[PDB]
């Protein structure tokens, strides 16, 4: 119910990347599937991701965080890499099941 | 130094580099005297010679 959503929001605040201005989809460790998902991104989302990662590195260098108004909220955390990543995993699974037969 | 350094530009370059080379030789001399702790130079100083070093 709503308790699980509130507890997920508490864990999202406890994770800490939102205090660096990051999103969830920026925190993915880039494997080959994630690399192809980034390669399929539009240029504006790619530039936004590069600036967000650069700002997070600049903040982690100084051991500081953004002010609390500039934290990434749980509501507008748009999941932008999920459809590209889903099609990449689907195509890789298609190649896998072809090669297994 | 066969023939191509026999020129006035190279002599004035060497004359420009005399004080830097002399200062670096002075640096090497003072560093050698301090590091090997030579008695024959450090006996004619006002302050270091109190330790005999």
């Amino acid at each position: 119910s709503k308790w699980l959503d509130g507890f997920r929001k508490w864990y999202y605040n406890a994770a800490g990347f939102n205090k660096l201005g990051l999103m969830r989809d920026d925190t993915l460790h880039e494997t080959e599937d994630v690399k192809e998902a980034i390669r399929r991104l539009p240029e504006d989302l790619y530039n936004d991701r590069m600036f967000r990662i650069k700002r997070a590195l600049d903040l982690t260098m100084r051991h500081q965080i953004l002010p609390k108004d500039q934290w990434t909220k749980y509501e507008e955390d748009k999941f932008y890499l999920e459809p590209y990543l889903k099609e990449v995993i689907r195509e890789r699974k298609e190649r896998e099941e072809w090669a297994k037969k | 130094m066969l023939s191509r350094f026999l020129g006035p530009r190279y002599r004035e370059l060497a004359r420009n580099w005399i004080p830097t080379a002399g200062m670096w030789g002075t640096v090497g001399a003072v560093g050698l005297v301090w590091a090997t702790d030579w008695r024959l130079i450090l006996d004619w100083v006002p302050y270091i010679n109190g330790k005999f070093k």
């Binding site: 864990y11 994770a15 925190t27 993915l28 460790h29 590069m50 650069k54 600049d58 982690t60 260098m61 | -």
Partner: protein, 380 residues
């Protein structure tokens, strides 16, 4: 004209490695530690060279040669206690370096990780034989204990141990070959560390966030050069206050007696960087099983790349696995404390629970926690 730094065939390697190497801007002080290890390594070699200039590997004249180094050689006490305390500080930097690699997900560099595990085995063997070398009571009896548990191996253990010994017990053949092996092993460690740095530089280094650091990268010079000089000077501070103020807080008093095969000490233990391994060994009531558990403890440290079941590399944004990690670190501290204790109540049950929790946290609970946060962040 040309650029002599980038075009000289020898200076190109130093330029690519320590001058114009692209490095992450946001790496913390833990990234100093491995460089400190290399510095500590050569420090050991330098001190060891001078300790090789007055030591005689012979059971009649080993302890007397060590006392001659301590008393008659000019500042020989300083170089000897620098060698011993720098071995201890080398293991301090080793555990902090490996803990950095475990926490920040640096074990995804698989070839670098396995090469490092090989370096870890080599430095542990080097320190064990070096501790045997001064031929005190604890040196002789620790060598006896380690070779007996090596002799616990079925059907090849006895032959292997009498071939390692060069005889039917620990004698001067063992002492001389341990001197030769303890001499030669750090150069193998140095070449292996060159391979370690080669694999890292062809794969790049990692930031504490675990993200792609190619957006913000800086040259190694002059940032991390001066940062490593500061780390080297702090490491020298701790090493010098250990060698000049408390020379024997980590040492063993029973090592200051001459070696006697007739007299056994009331308590036999190795040094503090072997104590958690000894406590893991002492818990299992099977000597073959105990040696199996020791080797597989270091091998599941090597096997840690294959247990990564999370989409996030570092533990910066993974607090449950952070909690499990600090339980693991505290469990390692507990095993270190138990390893210096005798087999009395209540140390057996505490050591058994500690080893069980150590293997369970490394093998079972960490991928389970990774899957739990993967579900909990709607990742899958």
């Amino acid at each position: 004209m040309t650029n002599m730094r980038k075009t000289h065939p020898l200076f190109k390697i130093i330029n690519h490695s320590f001058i114009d190497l692209p490095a992450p801007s946001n790496i913390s002080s833990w990234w100093n530690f491995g460089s400190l290890l290399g510095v500590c390594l050569m420090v050991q070699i330098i001190t060891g060279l001078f300790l090789a200039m007055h030591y005689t590997s012979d059971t009649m004249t080993a302890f007397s040669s060590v006392t001659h180094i301590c008393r008659d050689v000019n500042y020989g006490w300083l170089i000897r206690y620098m060698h011993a305390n720098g071995a201890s500080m080398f293991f301090i930097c080793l555990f902090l370096h490996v803990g950095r690699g475990l926490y920040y997900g640096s074990y995804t560099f698989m070839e670098t990780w396995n090469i490092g595990v090989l370096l870890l085995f080599a430095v542990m063997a080097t320190a064990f034989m070096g501790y045997v070398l001064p031929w005190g009571q604890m040196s002789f009896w620790g060598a006896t204990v380690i070779t007996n548990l090596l002799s616990a191996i079925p059907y090849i253990g006895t032959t292997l141990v009498e071939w390692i010994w060069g005889g039917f017990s620990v004698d001067k053949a063992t002492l001389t070959r341990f001197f030769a092996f303890h001499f030669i092993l750090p150069f193998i460690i140095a070449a292996l560390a060159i391979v370690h740095l080669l694999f890292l530089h062809e794969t790049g280094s990692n930031n504490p966030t675990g993200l792609n650091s190619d957006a913000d990268k800086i040259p190694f010079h002059p940032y991390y050069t001066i940062k490593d000089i500061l780390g080297i000077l702090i490491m020298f501070l701790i090493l010098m206050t250990l060698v000049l103020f408390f020379p024997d807080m980590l040492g063993d008093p029973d090592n200051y007696m001459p070696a006697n095969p007739l007299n056994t000490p009331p308590h036999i233990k190795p040094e503090w960087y072997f104590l958690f391994a000894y406590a893991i060994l002492r818990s299992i009531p099977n000597k073959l099983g105990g040696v199996l558990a020791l080797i597989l403890s270091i091998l599941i440290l090597a096997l840690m790349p294959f247990l990564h079941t999370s989409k996030q590399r570092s533990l910066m944004f993974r607090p449950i696995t952070q909690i499990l990690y600090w339980i693991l670190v505290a469990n390692l501290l507990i095993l270190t404390w138990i390893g210096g204790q005798p087999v009395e109540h209540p140390f057996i049950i505490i050591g058994q629970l500690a080893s069980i929790s150590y293997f369970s946290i490394i093998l079972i609970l960490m991928p389970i926690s990774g899957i739990i946060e993967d579900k909990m962040l709607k990742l899958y």
